[PDB]
Glycogen phosphorylase, muscle form
Amino acid sequence: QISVRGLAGVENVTELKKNFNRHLHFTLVKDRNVATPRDYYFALAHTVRDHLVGRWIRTQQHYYEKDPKRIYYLSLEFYMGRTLQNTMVNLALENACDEATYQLGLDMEELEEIEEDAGLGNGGLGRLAACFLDSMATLGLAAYGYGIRYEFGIFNQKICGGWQMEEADDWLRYGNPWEKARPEFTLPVHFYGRVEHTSQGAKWVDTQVVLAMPYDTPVPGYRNNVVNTMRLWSAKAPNDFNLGYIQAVLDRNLAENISRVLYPNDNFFEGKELRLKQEYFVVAATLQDIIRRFKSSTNFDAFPDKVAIQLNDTHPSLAIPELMRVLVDLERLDWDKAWEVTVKTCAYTNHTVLPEALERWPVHLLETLLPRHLQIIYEINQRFLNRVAAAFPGDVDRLRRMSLVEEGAVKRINMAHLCIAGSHAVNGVARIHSEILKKTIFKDFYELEPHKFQNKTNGITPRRWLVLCNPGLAEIIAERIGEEYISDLDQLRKLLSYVDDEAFIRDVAKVKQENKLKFAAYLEREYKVHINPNSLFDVQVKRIHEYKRQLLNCLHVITLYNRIKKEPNKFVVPRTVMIGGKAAPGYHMAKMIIKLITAIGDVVNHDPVVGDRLRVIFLENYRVSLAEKVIPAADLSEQISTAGTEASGTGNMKFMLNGALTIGTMDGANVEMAEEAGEENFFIFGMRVEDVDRLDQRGYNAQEYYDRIPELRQIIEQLSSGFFSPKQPDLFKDIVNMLMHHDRFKVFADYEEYVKCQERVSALYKNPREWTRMVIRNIATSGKFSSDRTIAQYAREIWGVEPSRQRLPA
Amino acid sequence: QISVRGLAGVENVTELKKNFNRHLHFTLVKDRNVATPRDYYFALAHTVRDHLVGRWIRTQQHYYEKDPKRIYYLSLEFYMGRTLQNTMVNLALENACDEATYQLGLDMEELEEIEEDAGLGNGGLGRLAACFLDSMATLGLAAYGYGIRYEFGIFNQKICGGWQMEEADDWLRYGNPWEKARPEFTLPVHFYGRVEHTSQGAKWVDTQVVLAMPYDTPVPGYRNNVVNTMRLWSAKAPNDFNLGYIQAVLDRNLAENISRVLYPNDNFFEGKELRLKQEYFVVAATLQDIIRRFKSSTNFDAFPDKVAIQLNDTHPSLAIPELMRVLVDLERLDWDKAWEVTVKTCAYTNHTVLPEALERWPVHLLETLLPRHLQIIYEINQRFLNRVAAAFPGDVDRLRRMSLVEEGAVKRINMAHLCIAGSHAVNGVARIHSEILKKTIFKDFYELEPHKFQNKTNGITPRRWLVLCNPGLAEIIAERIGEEYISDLDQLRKLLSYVDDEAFIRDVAKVKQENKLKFAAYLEREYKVHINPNSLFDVQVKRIHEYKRQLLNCLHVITLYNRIKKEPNKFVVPRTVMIGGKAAPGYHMAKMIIKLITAIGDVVNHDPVVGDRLRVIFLENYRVSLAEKVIPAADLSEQISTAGTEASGTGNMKFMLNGALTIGTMDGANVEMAEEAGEENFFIFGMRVEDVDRLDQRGYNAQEYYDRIPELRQIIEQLSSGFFSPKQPDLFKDIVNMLMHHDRFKVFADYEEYVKCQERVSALYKNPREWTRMVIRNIATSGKFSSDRTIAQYAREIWGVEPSRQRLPA
Ligand SMILES: O=[N+]([O-])c1ccccc1/C=N/NC(=S)N[C@@H]1O[C@H](CO)[C@@H](O)[C@H](O)[C@H]1O
Ligand SMILES: O=[N+]([O-])c1ccccc1/C=N/NC(=S)N[C@@H]1O[C@H](CO)[C@@H](O)[C@H](O)[C@H]1O
Ligand SMILES: O=[N+]([O-])c1ccccc1/C=N/NC(=S)N[C@@H]1O[C@H](CO)[C@@H](O)[C@H](O)[C@H]1O
Ligand SMILES: O=[N+]([O-])c1ccccc1/C=N/NC(=S)N[C@@H]1O[C@H](CO)[C@@H](O)[C@H](O)[C@H]1O
């Protein structure tokens, strides 16, 4: 049908069709008379999957022969989404399969909707891992993703009476065609026990053993015949576990609970034993696998030449003392050499500055669970602090600030300090974030070892986030500049010479309108909601957090409503305001924010004076597959975190690539996005990081804003009095009181400038041609935000490997 | 290589080889350089499996069109063993696969050894279900096996210091190529709750729901292109289960524990809640599936014309009140019509007379777990007892003896009484067992409804139990009489005209010697034990029980040892005495018996005066796959239960088919075996049922035998004094005291006649030619004991269906 989706040759279509029928019969054990759409999806998935295997075997064969330096990307989260379409795209099979299935009397799009999301992450950090794997494969790096195969991923979100309800994400119920179980490569992981000191060093004894069983998932690069591996570990009890009889067998679940469920906290630390077990489990099994692969190439001097370990936040920080444990206790290297090897092998990426998000493990937990690791940590700390003492003599406060061991009520280990001490590189995830790390929370470390500190601005994959979710846009782009930009997103700059091209302007705007129409119909079919596709699509989608300021959006929404009720017969640009996202189950305020959004919708959406001029929709169960639908449909991207709080953001980049304009603060990657596009082409408002600082020093007083802004006062009074909750007038008292007395994120301080900036957005939307020209200038300068760029910088500046765009033989 | 294993045509071998390579590449994701024997086994299993699918789909299609009466065989146990060889045999692929794999440079036999046993049963009752499924498919019946897919089957038995250790049977670890998950056909099962009475009848409300997910396994008939289904249910929690958050997800295991592990009791009742849950789970899910299939053909009058339900013991007895529940509460039939439908649908097979094996569920358990079922049971009981009162007026003691409700400390439900009241047929499993049912434990029921009571003597499948495990014997037989006997075992009678044939005699004896040599080498390879293949192979393999009298065998063994030590230079026929079997984990005496056997071995096997004249081996981890090895190798089958205790036995039949002679009591099927072969051709000894009765009335006094038999006295003194346990002299005091003061099974009473009969066995073995002629007379008269015969009698006399030997189109 469309060019970028590949060729539909006669030989290929015929072949796909017969393999489809073969799988339906032999694999699914069905005939055409009993088969359901789900069966058809599976026959298609197996047919496509077969095309991966040859490439998968030869990629891994190639790495064995050439022996390049291997990259190990360690994360507790891989937010993968669906795999079928992505595989077709990267293998250039999309048109061929579309034809084959059409000829079988099937609609491929309908079959695509059956696949469950692999929801093995919470949000930004998990999705970054998934974009990174895609780019690493596309760039020909010998890269392996390592994590945990959770039986239950992020919960499905139901909205009931305006409240979030959680239900188990049973994503494996029908089976996962994309994973290959590898029980033959099962490895032991040790817990508890005690340390014995002998003639020749320490020994960790009387441990409980949990088995780590790997499941491999293929990761295809873009049209280069490279297929890398994501290896996810699953917990299994040994066969003599607890071995009355019946209970012993039933108690096996105690060990297997390790890989059962993803912790659903975004940017928040919870110090639970099960979470710590998860962190060690992934690290211990992964490191044995790395060492095994290295030995099958005595001399650990070459280890850092053959191995890079990237730590995705502090969650796998135990890799540092675990590598020390293995090198010192088992391989019998001396401490100093082991340490040199570890530092040169490990690198650490920080994803947040929020204090409540930082991992600080109680010492009594590590003592019981990982006694040898605690001893190694103490020894790391002592040797590190001697270096500090020698560099900054007499600075006794620096000693306590930098210690890996924190003093107080309960002693804790600061995992971030551990990572910096044990890594040769530390990076933040956008220029402003990395600067903040050097100036504030890691200042002392930066002064000791300035050479460690780097920036690697985040990116997103243009395969999933343009070609896959927005074929129409990808196609009009390819018509003018070719197909090469898909793996070199910088070529989008060439679109600048089309900014005054009348045909292009029409095409860009036509693609948006079609995406909006398709999304508006999706909303009716699956959720029975009536929206106007001519309105401005104002969207904020991301996890529910106070720092992300969904509440600031709520205040704008109510202001628009109040202004309409004030002057009903005055003209306003119609808006559909969409807010979606999950709240962590224990996060009371986030759950209150969701309830507020639905309550506002309940009033706004049923007021006859408003008409179809303002709609407020809560997008239930926001996840990767929903993002692929709503992002192409958006006109306005809401990126409105308090300056200094959002480390980077990646949702922002997605919207930029797909033809939305951005309203946002100078936070995270927003700064670099506006710098690339030009500030005139961005809707920037609000305090900068410097303004926030000034306000903190003086003291933030919310009452001041309330007193001086009548429109704001009215909203607070509406909230307090029960305007949005007639039956429970006090429902939102917690929200009001937080806003008035304990707002860490200064929602009121940005309100006036936000409302003003929102008026300027509305003015620009009244002029379709100029709106679209600004869109073209955004799309055209979004190239920097490809994860291919990000990964090439990791490769060159951290891992010491050269990327390659060269094909492997087919 | 050999005739009965089918043709190895050029087209077929070529095809198998390429499908083997296709699976290795696409299915296993391996190449020949990294593949292990386990991978090769899997490629073979998938290749063979493909041949089932077409036949499987058309068999089930055929049943849909023809709509025959369906047979549902309900069991908590299906002891299947391995499936690969069985499938090759029934599909006539064995030689072709042997050739194909040979040409690939592989040994098929070695690949066969990799497959795990499906160990989903304890012993006789479970293996009977598996033989029955095979015969039902071979006879073209529309039959379905229904049970539970246990995650852990019967435990693996390790012997450590002479003691049994249990370890989890993790049979699914590498995956099961033979099952197809059918998540689309998942069904709800209800537990707990309470009964509400409304205008229109009772309603069972506030229940907890557990999901039943089916897994289908193909069951091929012998060379007739019939493939039936065994459907096993697996327990799954619903997605809103318990829905802090993390705990709720982890507590899902509480629901899923239902299908976790097989209860490992043979012929013994344990009244545990989890066991009851298992029994209801299988019944509730199965019955919904039956009713669904019946409706997809309003009028339940035709239900018994279209459905037979066979209850394998009382374990699925809850089918009776569950069918009543569904018909009365949900379909709104009146009681009397529902009851008529139930009786005509259900039939009950009894497998034991032992009182401790009978299920008697406490009322307080059913009250909490299944409140509606208890009410229905009470109502069944009341209406049943009114029939008894009307037939036997004034017989008040008959009323209390026959009640389904037992009075006393705790009120209990007698599940056996439930089954008889609610079934149109009740059968025992051998003629003497069925007679015992009518004369003793079910006398009152027999007097009320004589027409209900039947016999169906057990049988074994000649596919697994001759062709598969003993190809050499199957081949020399087929050379003389053709191949037709494999599905008509009565044709073996024709071998009687070969009893004086010198060529045959030589061939029969040659096959045994080769089986003994192969087994002797197996013992060295896997267990490092030195046995003499010229000795008589004296074997007792079965579950360890006091009623099976492994202890009587032990006494003989010690007697032989003492006689040798007494007269060392006297000649005795050399024996290898093999005893194997598992003890239930809670069964202290059974575990002591195992320890005794190994202790005897420790003394006997290392005494230089004995030499290779007597060896005592405990066969560790006895299971279906081990039975297939040891049975073909046996010379003497030990079938020595106290008369009246072994309902049938099936191991006995296996040995008879494979050329062992039988030493045994007139118990269970032994009576019919000796009747078929002639008593002159059987080594019968001991009390008959009548002699046991006489002894009970007088009072069994073990001291009397001890006083009058010096050889027996010596053994007891050796046991008491610590001869077989020098370091712990009192180790066996529990055994001695049981034998002397509380022996329910009268071991001493049969000792003298057993020893005497054992001398006569030894005399016959001294004359090879006459031993072998007696063997031929046994093999030749074993036809009655084919499960094809058994199933044809069930079909004609209970189910009301005609078997058929006709092929379906290929
Ligand atoms: O991971 N993959 O996407 C992929 C690509 C191509 C072929 C198989 C796979 C994954 N297979 N994963 C699994 S668990 N395969 C399993 O392999 C077993 C024997 O090892 C077979 O019994 C099963 O038929 C198959 O499901
Ligand atoms: O990964 N997590 O969601 C998680 C689980 C449990 C405890 C802390 C966390 C921390 N999450 N931190 C996250 S999502 N940080 C996010 O990372 C993205 C990728 O670089 C950035 O673009 C965002 O600015 C940042 O907030
Ligand atoms: O039951 N069988 O013996 C049998 C005969 C022929 C083909 C498949 C089977 C059993 N397959 N059992 C299972 S769980 N197959 C599964 O089917 C899934 C889709 O439904 C696929 O994702 C997997 O590749 C496959 O393992
Ligand atoms: O099936 N079980 O092993 C079980 C588990 C839990 C409680 C009672 C039992 C009862 N088992 N009863 C058994 S094995 N009876 C056996 O059935 C065979 C087949 O007809 C007969 O040949 C045997 O004579 C009989 O003992």
